[model samples]
Target: EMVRGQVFDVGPRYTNLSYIGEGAYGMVCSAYDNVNKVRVAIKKISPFEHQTYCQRTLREIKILLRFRHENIIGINDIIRAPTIEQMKDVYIVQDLMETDLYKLLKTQHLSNDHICYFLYQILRGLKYIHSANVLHRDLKPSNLLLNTTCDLKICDFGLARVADPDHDHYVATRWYRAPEIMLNYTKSIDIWSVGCILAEMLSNRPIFPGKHYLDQLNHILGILGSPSQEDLNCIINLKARNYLLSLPHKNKVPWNRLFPNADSKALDLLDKMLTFNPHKRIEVEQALAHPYLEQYYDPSDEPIAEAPFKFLDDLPKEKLKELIFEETARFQPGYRS
Candidate 1:
């Protein structure tokens, strides 16, 4: 007999369920995959409630199916509702990680080796994502899944999009957001987020813990100092440029003082990564070659480009569902709900 919160009979081949955590769109659980003979994480998303929610879920499915990387979470199966009446329920089965970076950071103090390796994996993953011409708008500790072996994989592509110059700038989570993003930025936005996560790993807390959007800019300014007139002029928003100029001139905090215990090489890389100017910021490929990551760097580790896909985000609700079904059937023919 199944008890409260037990998901023993959720999917056909996935059994022996245990509750994991809830995502923005669905309930997540851990289960055993009878076919693969392994434990997996299952996210059950319901697209019936709201059109926007359904569209987002379908978009996520599309993106996940196209990705194949060691440092990116793999989707094992996608199970749809068996009947028309239950069309709302959709199940996504994926690799089961021991925990996420957020949970691990809460309990453990990471060593230098751990930080370096973690950042390497993140950059490696980002390399693949960027090669595919996609922007992972959201990059935070919680979205970085990890295991006991110190391997890390980036997950949750619900907010990801192709690098569109006209795309929304206010897309990423506040803390890890890049400055240009506040003015509507692009690929460099993910690089800025990587810097933020690296800083968090070093300090064991968010580097810029802003309470809100305005406060977020202030926090960044307080640490990195005011942007140059040239950089400020690049802001497309007139009011935003003036507002930034209105702030008092703030001298930059020395990297050593900001990260007192961090070695010079690490500080040098951090400086490049956390640059206020998006154009000047260190890209993933350059950062991977930095002295701080020299020990782990391999020439062949560079990511190769993949054929870019046309990401469809503005489809009607019914079309979105149809596309999702088609993708699922094509990629996961044996999936059952």
Candidate 2:
């Protein structure tokens, strides 16, 4: 039923379409919605291509359905293949945005207010997510969507979980990964990613653009300095701990040097965020209250999910396709969350 899209093909109701981009999982296109009369991004997910492809597509669709916060990606509709045998491509339609946080960081000059509100929205959005006991295991700048008005929405829930758990050696993108996530997952790891993002905003580049995980650790050490003897306890992996000691020891670099002429409160929150000990990391609620984001902080305006997120782990491949197909019907305009 695909019409011409980017001179390619999309569905019947979607008109004037063009391919925006593509990823390993699927392709994306920007188009006009004839039914709703708005711009939207349509992602064509090939759910059955492989194991991860199926698992993540099915998993992401369910999570997006329940998360209704303004700062998270808002779903418009979902398209299912005509029948069970045809259940290969699924289209997810969402509100169109001007750009992602990553592109803005590269092309535009940001002010202190820009950084404050952007960080505030991300934290605000995550509060709703964690309230549901979900951990957005991956929190990078690119995953943050932005409007021309400066509103930010968190996207890419495929890598997220119920603040619980992963398959491959992959963690978060190394440069933005917390040392704790390198060894394990926790609520604090997401906090660490925000810290990295804040640092990037202040300094105009990644604080730790490591080529790999080893270099990523070195980058953190170069700034925060070597962990104290007691700080090593958080790494339950003795093997990890042993290597941590073998690495070169360094003195902590003063914040002023790293972020010159920056707001002191911003640096203070940054310090709390990029802590050596995972236990000491600043949480979303506390980070929202910190001086840097004080102007935009409003506890009452923030909403939390009433129920905990539920997702199947290590699900059977056959069952996953069935799940994904059933999920598409929920977003077909009649069903409500």
lDDT digits (tens) for residues 238-302 of candidate 1? 86777767778899999789888876887788889899888888988899899898988885866
Error of 2 at 206 (Å): 0.9
**Pairs of colliding residues, candidate 2:** 2-10, 5-8, 135-163
- What C-alpha RMSD separates each model from the true structure? 2.6, 2.7
Candidate 2 lDDT, 185-211, residue by residue in tens? 468889999999989988779999889
- TM-scores for all candidates? 0.92, 0.93
| Model 2 CA lDDT for position 249 | 81
Candidate 1 vs. truth: CA RMSD?
Answer: 2.6
Show model 1 residue runs off by greater than 4 Å: 1-9, 83-85, 166-170, 331-337
